[PDB]
Amino acid sequence: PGASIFRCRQCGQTISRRDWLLPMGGDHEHVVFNPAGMIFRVWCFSLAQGLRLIGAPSGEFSWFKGYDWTIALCGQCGSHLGWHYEGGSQPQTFFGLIKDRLAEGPA
Ligand SMILES: O=C1CC[C@H](n2ccc3ccccc32)C(=O)N1
Ligand SMILES: [Zn+2]
Structure with a gap:
């Protein structure tokens, strides 16, 4: 498999796996804006x-x-990869990572 691990696009640090993608509200992809109007394509990971x-x-x-x-x-490398989410239910925690800041490849 050549599409199984996600690494930091800037340095190659191991970050997550395609296996760990999470459909929150029925989709793993959420397009969102911060208060400064910056758009992020976010993928949820368990x-x-x-x-x-x-x-x-x-x-x-x-x-x-x-x-x-x-x-x-x-x-x-300290590149901003996303956010960790806590304090809810099903699940209590998850990660919202900025899709275009990750590189997908082989395990
Ligand atoms: O769920 C989130 C993550 C952080 C993000 N965010 C990004 C910059 C920012 C400044 C103030 C408050 C929030 C901020 C956001 O808008 N929502
Ligand atoms: Zn990095």
């Missing part, structure tokens, strides 16, 4: 590794009802 979660969670402008977010950087 699980991710190789990140560094920055600060404490915030509910402010959460794209996912009932979840608080933390900034998720690449733990290797």
Whole structure:
């Protein structure tokens, strides 16, 4: 399989797997805008590794009802890869990662 692991596009750090994609609200892809109007194509993952979660969670402008977010950087290079979500149910936690900041390839 050549499409099974997601790595940081900037450095190659191991981040997630196609197996760990999560359909939240019926789709793994969510297109969203931050308060500064920046558009992100976000893929939900049940699980991710190789990140560094920055600060404490915030509910402010959460794209996912009932979840608080933390900034998720690449733990290797510090590139902004997305957010970790916590404090909801089914599931309690998940990752929302910026699709175009990942590279897909072989295990
Ligand atoms: O679910 C989220 C993640 C963080 C994101 N976000 C990105 C910048 C920003 C500044 C203030 C509050 C929120 C912010 C967002 O809009 N929603
Ligand atoms: Zn990186």
